[PDB]
Amino acid sequence: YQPTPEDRFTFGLWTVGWQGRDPFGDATRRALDPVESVQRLAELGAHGVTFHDDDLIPFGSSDSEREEHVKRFRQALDDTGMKVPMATTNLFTHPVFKDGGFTANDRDVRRYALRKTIRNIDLAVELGAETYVAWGGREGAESGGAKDVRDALDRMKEAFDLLGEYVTSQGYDIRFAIEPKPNEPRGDILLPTVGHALAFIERLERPELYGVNPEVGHEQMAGLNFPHGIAQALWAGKLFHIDLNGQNGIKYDQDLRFGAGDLRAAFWLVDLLESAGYSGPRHFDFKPPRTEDFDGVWASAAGCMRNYLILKERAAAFRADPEVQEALRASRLDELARPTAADGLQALLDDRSAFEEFDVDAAAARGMAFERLDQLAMDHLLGAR
Amino acid sequence: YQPTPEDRFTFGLWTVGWQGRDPFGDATRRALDPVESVQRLAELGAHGVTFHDDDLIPFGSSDSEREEHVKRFRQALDDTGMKVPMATTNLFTHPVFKDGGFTANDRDVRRYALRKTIRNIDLAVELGAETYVAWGGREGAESGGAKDVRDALDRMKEAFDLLGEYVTSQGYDIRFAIEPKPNEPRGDILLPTVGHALAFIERLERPELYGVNPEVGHEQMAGLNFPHGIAQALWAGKLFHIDLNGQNGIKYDQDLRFGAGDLRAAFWLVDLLESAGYSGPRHFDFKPPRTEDFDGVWASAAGCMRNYLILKERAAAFRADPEVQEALRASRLDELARPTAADGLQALLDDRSAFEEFDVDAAAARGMAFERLDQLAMDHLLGAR
Amino acid sequence: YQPTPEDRFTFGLWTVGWQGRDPFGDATRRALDPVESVQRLAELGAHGVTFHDDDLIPFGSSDSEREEHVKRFRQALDDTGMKVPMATTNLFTHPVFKDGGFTANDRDVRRYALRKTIRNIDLAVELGAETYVAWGGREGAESGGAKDVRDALDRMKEAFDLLGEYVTSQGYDIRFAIEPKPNEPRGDILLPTVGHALAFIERLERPELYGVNPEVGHEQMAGLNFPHGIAQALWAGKLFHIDLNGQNGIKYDQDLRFGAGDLRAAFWLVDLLESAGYSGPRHFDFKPPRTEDFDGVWASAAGCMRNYLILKERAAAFRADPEVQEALRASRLDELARPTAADGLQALLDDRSAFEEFDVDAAAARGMAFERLDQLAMDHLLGAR
Amino acid sequence: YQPTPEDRFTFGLWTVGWQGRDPFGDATRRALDPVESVQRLAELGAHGVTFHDDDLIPFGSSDSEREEHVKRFRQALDDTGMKVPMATTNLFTHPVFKDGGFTANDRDVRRYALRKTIRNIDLAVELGAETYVAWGGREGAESGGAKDVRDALDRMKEAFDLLGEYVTSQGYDIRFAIEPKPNEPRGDILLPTVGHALAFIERLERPELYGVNPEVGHEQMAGLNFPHGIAQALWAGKLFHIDLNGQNGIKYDQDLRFGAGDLRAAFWLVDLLESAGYSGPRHFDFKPPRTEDFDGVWASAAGCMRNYLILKERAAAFRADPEVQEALRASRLDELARPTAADGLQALLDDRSAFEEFDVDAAAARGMAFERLDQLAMDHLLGAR
Numbered sequence A, B, C, D: 001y002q003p004t005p006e007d008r009f010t011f012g013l014w015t016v017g018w019q020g021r022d023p024f025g026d027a028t029r030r031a032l033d034p035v036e037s038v039q040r041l042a043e044l045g046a047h048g049v050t051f052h053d054d055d056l057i058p059f060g061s062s063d064s065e066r067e068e069h070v071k072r073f074r075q076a077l078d079d080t081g082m083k084v085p086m087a088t089t090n091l092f093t094h095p096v097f098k099d100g101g102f103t104a105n106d107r108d109v110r111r112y113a114l115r116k117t118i119r120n121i122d123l124a125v126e127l128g129a130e131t132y133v134a135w136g137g138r139e140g141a142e143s144g145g146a147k148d149v150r151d152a153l154d155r156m157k158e159a160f161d162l163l164g165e166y167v168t169s170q171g172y173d174i175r176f177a178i179e180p181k182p183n184e185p186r187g188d189i190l191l192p193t194v195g196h197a198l199a200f201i202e203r204l205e206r207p208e209l210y211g212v213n214p215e216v217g218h219e220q221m222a223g224l225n226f227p228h229g230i231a232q233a234l235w236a237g238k239l240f241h242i243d244l245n246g247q248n249g250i251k252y253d254q255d256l257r258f259g260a261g262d263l264r265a266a267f268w269l270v271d272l273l274e275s276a277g278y279s280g281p282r283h284f285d286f287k288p289p290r291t292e293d294f295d296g297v298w299a300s301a302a303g304c305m306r307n308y309l310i311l312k313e314r315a316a317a318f319r320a321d322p323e324v325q326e327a328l329r330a331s332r333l334d335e336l337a338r339p340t341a342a343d344g345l346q347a348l349l350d351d352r353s354a355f356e357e358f359d360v361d362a363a364a365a366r367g368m369a370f371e372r373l374d375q376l377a378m379d380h381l382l383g384a385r
């Protein structure tokens, strides 16, 4: 289970660089240099990294420090062969974003958020990123009178429409991916699920510029089936990027390594990405627990990749198994994939076997044989075949 | 706080007619006649009722019993002046729908579901209904291999496209409203939130035929902010109908009367429907607890209407209050409603006050004054002004 | 992975006998005869069965039908060698229990509940049961004024104290196990977790007669760590019996087969029962999904036992693995098991290395190496060692 | 609705002193001096304050700075007449506590935690505190192999037994209150609910020294009924102190001001504390949102007290209302408070009206009239009587 840079494994700077500050505790780990992380992640088998603006260039940097940071960074990528497939803006840490970036009630703030975002889009394009993610972690409210959601969705649409105008006036090949989250650190966050972010995109002036960046633990914080939401994003053609991690149910966002948390969901997610042939980065947006030293950091980033690769092999052996393929026909998966009425409306309406002479008791009596199927999936995931 | 039939209050037959069967218990109440419920609901001040096919006509009825039921029903509406604004199909109770209706793996089942739905659309139109709701409570799965969600979303789109072809070939004025629910009675239900149902609609052949029917307690079963989801539905123009009830957090669907459950959410929902000017039915989809006799039933349906009308008055007094209007300007709600950059992209880009000379420390220092605002809302809801 | 009747696998009659009625659907399966279930469960390898009164003898039975049912039953146990380790009362289905059994506001109801319970205790003892479970599924409320919880806990204590007086005046060897559940079918259920049921027991007149019956999916409906709650029950000496099943997070109680749901929790539960040497029944309180026919029923009851036995083997190989034992010392599990201050208070107070000369920076710097440990557990569960 | 220092309103230093650092954001507010907070809280009507060791004396302080801090503090209490009813240890912020304090796997850490706690017990007693709270926010785990819960509960019992030995060897009048929390900042926290903390206390050597400190939002993070858990703590005699705040359902701990969150729960909690006659501090453990400046801080701490006092008046008018008292008899609350069988076991057993001649159909038919009751409670909370 050794990754190679063909597995398309990526990591944010902020992930292995998390110092372990939490709502109740001080950092437990020193700040990593981005160049160290690039070299360490390359040795483990990763294929590239991603960044916020403010991961790479310290907030308030001059234009001469700005360039020094970027040049160092760039030398590390050239030295290791790592890519930068995705980049993003920090519109959540600084106190100025305490009411949001693109939806902050103060108009001057919303203009400043767009200017900070456009400056980093130019950087991203310079460093080769194909996808530009937007996670509006500060867009929301703790109380009902603080935010008119209609106005806020006008502002959000306005900001994303300007960014699409900017990208298409520069000639950039870059797409946008909106990342939903239902809460945390706002009481409630706007566009809180994949379905809200898909819907929203269909109102933008150029919807084809925008897809979604769903993260495992964000839909699971709403108690939702992550594989189900990713199947919808795939069905809409809008799975532009994906964040992988683990989460134990509806509580704070834990950001555990990928394969911790809900292990059977992780199996069914891998099964789906691989059989749909998703070809983007497999990006890990996780935090090594603050119990760990830098050894535990690199163990935890390794086990992300390892659990992906074990669950790919188990999903591949599940679908390849003739007994599974027989059970899938027993459960009528083959029939699900056929049109209901490709004969058309009229034929349907004149078809006496569809109503007047349908035997609803004989149909009701047929067993779906799902439990046998699911125990086959269980025996495959567990290697107990 | 007396309703009148101008308040537009409606109730399903199944709501006050719930006999109190639950996963662990037998009915506690005898079956009501639909004509009794119409007469009792009329006396309480309601403006109409809604029905499943199988509420009104017993599953398997001949065509001579079918008509007898409808004629009785119709005489009660003529006698009381109640309307039927909304109608819907039962594609969940019968054992034939145990794997779904429009997404059942068996193709014969999916054809039978569409035929049962079209027969009731003709009825609905006969009885004056404007909105036809679809709650696919059986569309989903308990295990990951049982349902391919891509195929299932093809089937669901196929069924809704046929229904739109049928309605527009009959000349019917009727629209469809999809009602999302995240789980229960399936493990996971397809289109589990308002945002998933909005997104889905944008893929149908005629999207303008379809909106959403959101229900209070369904988004709250995912831990989501119901007023936020309804603001999005309003922003998309797709709030066709609404189900009102209460729910205490993330657990089984309780269907408590409206104003029980999350009382401050109920306040902010009323505030929003009334200030957006939603003009559909205020429909109560609730179950009187099985602790109650028929006296407790009619008390519980009354208290729905009463709590709506109290919370309308409190929301109206909140928005009318000059001190509230001052606080809303203190918190910059007025600025949220202004465009971020109606000056356009270029101007934004050349505006030095938006970046190069933006004072981010002075902006960060400004307080949003949300807590004062929210305590004003609290004092108004509580009558402690 | 073949059970034998030495594995101590048991099943309720109500589990494989669930007809598939749910809040929204009719039965999908015919009623099983208890004698059939005994013979089928014996062939699969089970070691015994459990029952409600009203599983075995139809509510309202004469005393001549009562005995006929029991005699049939008994002949099936003699024919198969199945035991009856546990028995329990139905104080939830009948409408008379709509406000509870032992805590129903009506005093006549609470007297009737105790009389129905004592009659079945005599039966249980006749059929050899060692443990008598009490799940008060109707003890609770949907609204705050309906139940005074202090009075209700007086009534509950009163009922359990009478039952202990009855058992000890008959000379019976039988113990009681209280089964907690946080909600469903009441809004909120009294003693909603293992910790509330442990606490409660410490107020009964004879606490040594009472332990707990925790069920997987009940603590998981509160988002709680089931292995953690069972470790507490073990630490208190009060794990009298255990209900095993699966549950996908905080929602309705699904009762999935054991190993579905939260698979890593299932691993850590098996690890704990086996290394603590729990010696009671491994009882499966689950419902085969209503998608299934009787073939899917027996598949689902088989896969309970199979997943137990796979997860026992994986836990045994985890703890036996020298590299695991090394990692457990790396993470200082060995130190957790040592007293903090067996030197006593005074010595602690005079120990300068415990405060005045404790180097808190060197201690803070030590990594706990938990992630390496947890990936070892992952590789063992997955057979990817 | 003006507090006075007779209302017994208290606040932690850390509450109004929260600088607004969150998992994703920097402080938004400067650090308050404890003496300023004492003077500001006194003007608002509060009756005292509480503290962690490290709120009042900066971690690592000399013994000459230590005393300077305490003397300043003390002068502010003498100047304002504020009390210090409760004090507590910080065993969560420093990196040394990253695996816990009393349950940390490292034995040297667990000795250091006890020494830091005992030093602050002496301080507390000096400043008049009656209650000493222990919130073990770091006692738990993110993964199953990291913590053996049995060993950890031995360590926890050992630490609390030493603290009780210390207090009773010094002659101190001080009691301990354990505060449960189910998660955050650990994956899972040990003793995660009131019921687990009650149970645990019954194993300590001197249980009468220990009660519970429950907090609103902590039980609500498990989806539990906070008034129900406090009724149990009251029934056990172990409600030593209480933390008041608001929380919107199962998610991160929001710490909203008291009366935000679940407003009907807040009503029923006030009803219960007041009618049980709880006489401890009404302590607010809340965080003013980081959207606020210091004006919004003092608004938010004011609205805590105000919403308590409004909900006390509404609960008092509910219980005083003859129509309510009539409804409570209609719903048989009076009967709940009577013994079930004060006639004893034998009489119960010979009572033919309790079984052989009980009419279970007539009892089942009686309505509980809970919905009428609950709408009366609604009309009272809303002032719509």
Ligand SMILES: OC[C@@H](O)[C@@H](O)[C@H](O)[C@@H](O)CO
Pocket: A088, A089, A133, A134, A135, A137, A179, A181, A215, A243, A253, A285
């Ligand atoms: O919840 C935090 C969120 O997952 C964050 O890591 C975003 O993904 C990042 O800001 C954009 O990539």
Ligand SMILES: OC[C@@H](O)[C@@H](O)[C@H](O)[C@@H](O)CO
Pocket: B088, B089, B133, B134, B135, B137, B179, B181, B215, B243, B253, B285
């Ligand atoms: O959860 C049940 C659901 O709310 C149901 O009542 C639908 O609304 C009805 O089938 C369509 O109107």
Ligand SMILES: OC[C@@H](O)[C@@H](O)[C@H](O)[C@@H](O)CO
Pocket: C088, C089, C133, C134, C135, C137, C179, C181, C215, C243, C253, C285
């Ligand atoms: O939630 C249902 C509960 O699990 C029930 O099956 C009990 O365990 C049974 O009544 C007592 O054994």
Ligand SMILES: OC[C@@H](O)[C@@H](O)[C@H](O)[C@@H](O)CO
Pocket: D088, D089, D133, D134, D135, D137, D179, D181, D215, D243, D253, D285
């Ligand atoms: O969740 C944080 C917790 O509520 C904390 O504020 C404790 O109450 C304090 O450490 C002891 O008083």
Ligand SMILES: [Mn+2]
Pocket: A135, A179, A215, A243, A285
């Ligand atoms: Mn992410």
Ligand SMILES: [Mn+2]
Pocket: B135, B179, B215, B243, B285
């Ligand atoms: Mn509904």
Ligand SMILES: [Mn+2]
Pocket: C135, C179, C215, C243, C285
């Ligand atoms: Mn059970």
Ligand SMILES: [Mn+2]
Pocket: D135, D179, D215, D243, D285
């Ligand atoms: Mn607290």
